Amino acid sequence: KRSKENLPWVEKYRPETLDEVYGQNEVITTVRKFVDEGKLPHLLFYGPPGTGKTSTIVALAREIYGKNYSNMVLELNASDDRGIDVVRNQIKDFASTRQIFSKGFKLIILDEADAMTNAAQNALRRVIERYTKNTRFCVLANYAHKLTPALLSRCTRFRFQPLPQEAIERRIANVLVHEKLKLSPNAEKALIELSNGDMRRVLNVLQSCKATLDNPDEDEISDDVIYECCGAPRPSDLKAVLKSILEDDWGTAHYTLNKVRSAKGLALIDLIEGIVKILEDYELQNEETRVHLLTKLADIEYSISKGGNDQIQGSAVIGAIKASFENET
Amino acid sequence: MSLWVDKYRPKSLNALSHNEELTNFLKSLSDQPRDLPHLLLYGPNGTGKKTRCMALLESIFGPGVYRLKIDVRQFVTASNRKLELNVVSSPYHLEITPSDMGNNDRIVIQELLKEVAQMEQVDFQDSKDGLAHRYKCVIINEANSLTKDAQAALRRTMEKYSKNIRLIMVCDSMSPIIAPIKSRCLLIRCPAPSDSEISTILSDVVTNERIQLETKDILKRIAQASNGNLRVSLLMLESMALNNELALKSSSPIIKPDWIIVIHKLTRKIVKERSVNSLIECRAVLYDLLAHCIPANIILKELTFSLLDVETLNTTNKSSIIEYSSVFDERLSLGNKAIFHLEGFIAKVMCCLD
Amino acid sequence: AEQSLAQQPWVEKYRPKNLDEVTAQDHAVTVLKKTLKSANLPHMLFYGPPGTGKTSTILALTKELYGPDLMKSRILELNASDERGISIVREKVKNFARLTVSKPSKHDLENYPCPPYKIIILDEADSMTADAQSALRRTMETYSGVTRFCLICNYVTRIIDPLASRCSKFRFKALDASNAIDRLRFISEQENVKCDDGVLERILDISAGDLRRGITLLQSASKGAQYLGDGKNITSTQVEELAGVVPHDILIEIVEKVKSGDFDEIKKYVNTFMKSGWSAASVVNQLHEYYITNDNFDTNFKNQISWLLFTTDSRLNNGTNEHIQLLNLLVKISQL
Amino acid sequence: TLSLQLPWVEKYRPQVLSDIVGNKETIDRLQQIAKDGNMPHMIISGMPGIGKTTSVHCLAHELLGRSYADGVLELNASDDRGIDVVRNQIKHFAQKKLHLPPGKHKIVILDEADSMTAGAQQALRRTMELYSNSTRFAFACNQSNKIIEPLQSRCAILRYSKLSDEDVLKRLLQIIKLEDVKYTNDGLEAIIFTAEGDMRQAINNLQSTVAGHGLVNADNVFKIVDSPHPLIVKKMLLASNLEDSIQILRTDLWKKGYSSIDIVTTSFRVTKNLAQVKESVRLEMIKEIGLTHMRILEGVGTYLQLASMLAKIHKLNN
Amino acid sequence: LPKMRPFDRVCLDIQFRRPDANSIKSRLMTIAIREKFKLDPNVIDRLIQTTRGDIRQVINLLSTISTTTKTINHENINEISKAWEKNIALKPFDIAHKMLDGQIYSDIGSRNFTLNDKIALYFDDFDFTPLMIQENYLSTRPSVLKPGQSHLEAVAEAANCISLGDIVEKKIRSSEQLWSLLPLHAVLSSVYPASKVAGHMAGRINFTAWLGQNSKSAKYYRLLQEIHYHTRLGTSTDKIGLRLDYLPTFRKRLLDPFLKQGADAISSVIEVMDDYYLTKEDWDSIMEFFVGPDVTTAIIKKIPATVKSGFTRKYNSMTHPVAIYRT
Amino acid sequence: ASMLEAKFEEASLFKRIIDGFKDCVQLVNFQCKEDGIIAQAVDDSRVLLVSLEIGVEAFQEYRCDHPVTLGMDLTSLSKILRCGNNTDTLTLIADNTPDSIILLFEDTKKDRIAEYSLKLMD
DNA sequence: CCCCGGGGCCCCCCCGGC
DNA sequence: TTTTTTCGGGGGGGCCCCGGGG
Ligand SMILES: Nc1ncnc2c1ncn2[C@@H]1O[C@H](COP(=O)(O)OP(=O)(O)OP(O)(O)=S)[C@@H](O)[C@H]1O
Ligand SMILES: Nc1ncnc2c1ncn2[C@@H]1O[C@H](COP(=O)(O)OP(=O)(O)OP(O)(O)=S)[C@@H](O)[C@H]1O
Ligand SMILES: Nc1ncnc2c1ncn2[C@@H]1O[C@H](COP(=O)(O)OP(=O)(O)OP(O)(O)=S)[C@@H](O)[C@H]1O
Ligand SMILES: Nc1nc2c(ncn2[C@@H]2O[C@H](COP(=O)(O)OP(=O)(O)O)[C@@H](O)[C@H]2O)c(=O)[nH]1
Ligand SMILES: [Mg+2]
Ligand SMILES: [Mg+2]
Ligand SMILES: [Mg+2]
């Protein structure tokens, strides 16, 4: 723990205040208004990984309190035991007792509550309801089916959407300015495309790209660096593979696939995913073609997930695509 | 005395008769055993894999490997349950079958193998190179039955303590073995003996046992009726000789195991009566077979290969039978209740055949 | 000391000791090697096919970061051979991650970078349960200033999405005869292995991306050559025999029997073939190579046989009987 | 600001039995019991957010009054309710002597009784029979099948029903009047639609809408609150063309942040309650959805798997 | 219930059954006259059927309904009975009978008994329902067969789905603890297979036979393990190989001499058992393994008593070796 | 053993101090200066705060060059502190940028020396 | 110096969906 | 018209033994 410069970019660039959280305008505005007027309800932040839930709640707590929020809030996560005994004793005493340092209300943050047992969630119901006058609860979740209906009904739900492109571009610009780096527009587009709405992925990939460059001062991060560090297929490669599979004989398609994969050690799963994305735009004249494509490609993906014979898997991909498109005549 | 199958088992690499190429390969492996990698011997059952493993160990350490003792190790689960494992040991090697306890083999792998591998064999077991035997050999029998968790545990124990332990695993098929473990072992294929070699071994036993033989054709029939299984051939020869007052004749019938007879009768019944009542009787027969320590996979294999032998069936019926067998073998491999899958296979066979 | 590793198997003997001895993993070795100076090592997720150099890479990185002395006090290695339940994650891993980093010595600081953080290496993390992985999430983030995590696995899909998001992903490529030939040739030269031209390429092709298997095959070939003692060069046919590769003659006989189409003849031939001990995976791979790379068949036949071979390979990957699967595949191909 | 204001769900919690909307028969009967006495042992069952606990508390208060402090024993899931607790504390409370008005008795309120072990419930049998002259028992549960039949035979069953749109509208309008909230009828309709009959959710959504943007209209209401995803899944599974179903899965579920596990579980539930489709087709769709769920639970969770599941469902429905 | 098995035959089993409406009508009418509310004679039978003959529950019903409604006539029986309907969990036999009925799977009956009802019925006993279904799905005359389908095809489809449900069950009860798949199992193991062979029972609902068979298999496997590890020092095989290969020959070397020779063969059998460290109990256990035409129960029971007595006495009088020296 | 060297009058004193609040809080943090040792610990429930302010006069000798912070676990500290006699002298030793705290037990009459090092927590 | 109260482990027994 | 497998959590019974009082 020397300084912040010796930290991963995912942690080095954690939003400190609520103004540094991007892509969640509605939720941020609503929670800030609640803190302003003092109408904070029991909150349930539901969202996919790396969207700004933990950061948002920590920033909210630091905004309500000062820099001593660590001692004025009860934050429990999956790394800590949260059984029925914990809910009955520790959470109950925290909710029913005044603040040692300040003279304000109390906040309990049950992060990763989806990992809690049903008994603990059931016990939390009346604990939440009874001490509502001086206590408020915040629950952060990724999957909603693991939360009991009673807990869901007792909390106001806020959904963290996948981060749009615009917020990702702004945060990438901020990181580039801070790190003194240059990013090509096509490199930026590839980074946002591979992000899948996750900022942690963007930060990790950007750190890897900075590492790849010989001298990060003058050199620029081109899409080539993106694909080299991520080891992902190139759009031209995917298009060429699809063209060879759909318009050439078996020998030519096999040779093209093998050459493309061996050029940079491209993985079969990435090629399958890219081809699926490409075919999504295709306007098929027969529903059977799309049905067969989806089913057979899903089966191939499931087989790949458990390993097996890679060459046979690639041949199966080629054959499935050809057979499915044979129904377009 | 002991059974002929056990009384005439070769005790050294020089006493092996069939598969001379494999004997040469084993001798090559034993020339400089101080750098021997982990070995995985795979091949058909009853071919002599364990005999070759013992011969290699004898050639590496010495005859003392054949002085075996049985001890009992105690293990405790996370639930406080107590289990006992029977371990066969020699002054130079150990033999274990972790699959005896079932899903708890991981505990054995993580405790017993770790303890053995973390201890140095300081015994001055003078080897053939002038340096005392350093590494210790552990033979994991029936490795194909090990659970995947046990194999994952074995993965790094095989690598970290290679200086202290070497593993010789014997299996019949490599499909259940995970690729990471298969990559850490030297694979040794053990082909089954040919009919001529089996006949020669049977003739050697006959000459040593003073068994009257009308003609050498009987030994050829016995060898052809075993399908490469040498243990089955030897035991069948002994049973036939005893049942015929050590006076095997050209007309002496070939004996078959009782379970084989039951499976063949079940095949005939299935082929004749394709009805739900027949399916209920087949369920009863399957329960009877399974209750007496007859593995479900064995039953499925014999049933599939006996139904295909019926001459009243056509190509389409046999193709359907083999397809159903292929599907239900995987079903069995991915399930606990074998009777369910066996009944489903019989029902599908009856549907297609009818 | 020296004899301890001089008497070891070639796979362990020639394990990379530094990050510059890794053959064909530059795209990640360069990053891990520049973190030596940048001192901002992120959480790592090393995934790839078996025998590509993940454990060796992480061990070399630790050695180059800490050194022989400070390593043991800054590394916590846990693999599938230790209990790794939710209780272990909550107590032991959390406690180790919450400790202060060991004080580097003057010698260590003067000769090694001595990064200000410790490392926890969870090898074979794919076997860990989902609950433990979820419990590791906030532990990874809270103590990032003093601890870094490396999850090494083979099936990336077995890692929960949150942890995969918290870890920078590194894919280890397959080591084929095009990028790993140099290491095998160097090992052969060091071990004084006399082999004919193309033998190493054949070994690497048969290995199918696993350099450990190639090294083991080379060691077996060297042992056989030394035992025979004629002074000749190792031949490719010997490698194929030692690698469980069916001779081309038997494959051609199987192909002819399939072309015949008779069920009984195919069944008898398969029964005879299964008595030799050939592995079904090798037979399936060779059949796929022969059929997909032949101009005597039409598009429909190849399309159907590809799916048939894929289904057979998937079924054989679960631990199913080889005889039944091979017979079914051969019959279905015969009816194509 | 460090001084919060009470939420409307608590600030406007009914304190009398006449302020509870919905289940007119049961509420009137409880009012009659409160006015007369001789309260029987009762078990109140129903879905969340309908007013079971509120009704129980209002009845106990109106029945006892100043004796509420010494004549009510309230135990919930947050409090230990093991066999020892039942056999000592409840028994002592039942045996405790209290002089109450002529037609009043002590009350034991076991909230969330469905989370009690069978042993505790069995130990709760005779205490209700040998002390019925001094104490009465009220249970409030969501699942009524978790209470052992011997206890159910000892109590009157009050199965509260799902609240209708009229009751929610009435209560919401009353709260709006008491808080002077600017609203549009479309906003109230949207709030009711998204509440799904849960008064707590309706009040919380209304409070959030007012405190975030002011006017309660359809746009503002839907900006915070999203439409129930079960209805979206139902629409996706009832589409004619696979293209439309895939579009619904894509632009309405996948990109909104909904996890694959949630989508598959919701699809399973909706198909289980898809009365429109025949039973056999529903069973095949359930088989396919279960295959997809098993695939996802092993770590292979991707939009491709959901698309394949939808394609198989469409093939089954063709 | 198993818990009360100790009271099997140490006490007089007095049975009280659900009282009939005829006797309870008098009490209900007396209470009606006493408490000043109307209860027509035609309502008692239905009210009693509502509570499954629980007089206490009927009295509580009357007390509660009399609070506001003082008239209980045919105009309001339906609402009262629907609001106070008792829901008891059916037991294994009843669950199996209800599930294997062709009326709940019809297009008219499916509305009254929905898929939710069947899935909940599975959960009444989630450990015995699949076994009962698998045991009783071959003893029914179906009435839900599609045109052209025969009974054999329906049972085959049911068996296939039963195998799939067994795979799902294996997945559920594993290290991953995947209980969220329990509903799917209900459909795969119990509802779907019954829906294809649903109809009218052609006999009685038999209890699961797999439990006793599993117990027998475990017993025989333990015996085989003991025998195998008693002979590991003289054989080269596994327990499966011992069962399939060695035991047929051991029988000819251990039992046949008694049948053919008689008492004189005792010495040879003793010798053979001594060469493999085999005990008398091991001999019996080995003789208990054979099936089919090799069953030895009748053959052994037919051996003259003198030969067996001499065999036992000679074995006991002799000193024998030991394979495992448990210290 | 450069920054902090503090020997108590007897190990019983520090034992008694530790037992006074070892059942209330789990993790403690001492901040040793040239004036003494001060520790503040907050309970998991965040309801009880323990503050100890041992003074310089409670030690036979107390040397502390620079203010040094030591985070420790009360269970482990008590367990180690229970590995000594009631007639011995206990000295706390801390070095540059402490990674562990050394607890030395000395008995001059019996010429007994015992060592114990506890790793500090960040 | 000996007895009693009450904290703390140890062992076992049962659930697990909406 | 009768009766099985596994982790993790929770509950409930049983001691054990330190501490404190007499
Ligand atoms: N809205 C955001 N704005 C800026 N950075 C973000 C944002 N969301 C995520 N990040 C970045 O990703 C990192 C992780 O953010 P978190 O919100 O803490 O992750 P998380 O949402 O809690 O993950 P889950 O849902 O528990 S798997 C932050 O430190 C940021 O660097
Ligand atoms: N990149 C590599 N460069 C040189 N040798 C390698 C390389 N990868 C593997 N090997 C060789 O194979 C041996 C084993 O390598 P490992 O590091 O164990 O592979 P691995 O990635 O750990 O395999 P898995 O996924 O755990 S089964 C090494 O000692 C090396 O001799
Ligand atoms: N019938 C109702 N009339 C007026 N307000 C209601 C009504 N039902 C619920 N509410 C409101 O929602 C709040 C909570 O109602 P509750 O009584 O807690 O519902 P509940 O049925 O007891 O929840 P469960 O089943 O224990 S999860 C009350 O304070 C009321 O403000
Ligand atoms: N004469 C002779 N008999 C052999 C040879 N190899 C194996 N056997 C016999 O075959 C029997 C069974 O061999 P075994 O190794 O136990 O079979 P496996 O372990 O299942 O492969 C042994 O009892 C031997 O008698 C051989 O090389 N020569
Ligand atoms: Mg989080
Ligand atoms: Mg490894
Ligand atoms: Mg409530």
Residue numbers in the entry:
A (entry chain C): 7 to 335
B (entry chain E): 1 to 354
C (entry chain D): 18 to 353
D (entry chain B): 4 to 321
E (entry chain A): 460 to 786
F (entry chain F): -1 to 120
Paper's wording?
The DNA sliding clamp proliferating cell nuclear antigen (PCNA) is an essential co-factor for many eukaryotic DNA metabolic enzymes. PCNA is loaded around DNA by the ATP-dependent clamp loader replication factor C (RFC), which acts at single-stranded (ss)/double-stranded DNA (dsDNA) junctions harboring a recessed 3’ end (3’ ss/dsDNA junctions) and at DNA nicks. RFC is composed of four small AAA+ subunits, Rfc2-5, and one large AAA+ subunit, Rfc1, which assemble head-to-tail into a two-tiered partially open ring structure. To illuminate the loading mechanism we have investigated the structure of RFC:PCNA bound to ATPγS and 3’ ss/dsDNA junctions or nicked DNA using cryogenic electron microscopy.
In the intermediate state, PCNAC disengages from RFC to adopt a closed-like conformation. Densities corresponding to Mg2+-coordinated ATPγS are resolved in the nucleotide-binding sites of Rfc1, Rfc4, Rfc3, and Rfc2 in the closed and intermediate maps as is a GDP in the nucleotide-binding site of the non-catalytic Rfc5. In the first step, Rfc1 and PCNAA together pivot outward, separating PCNAA from PCNAC to form an intermediate state.
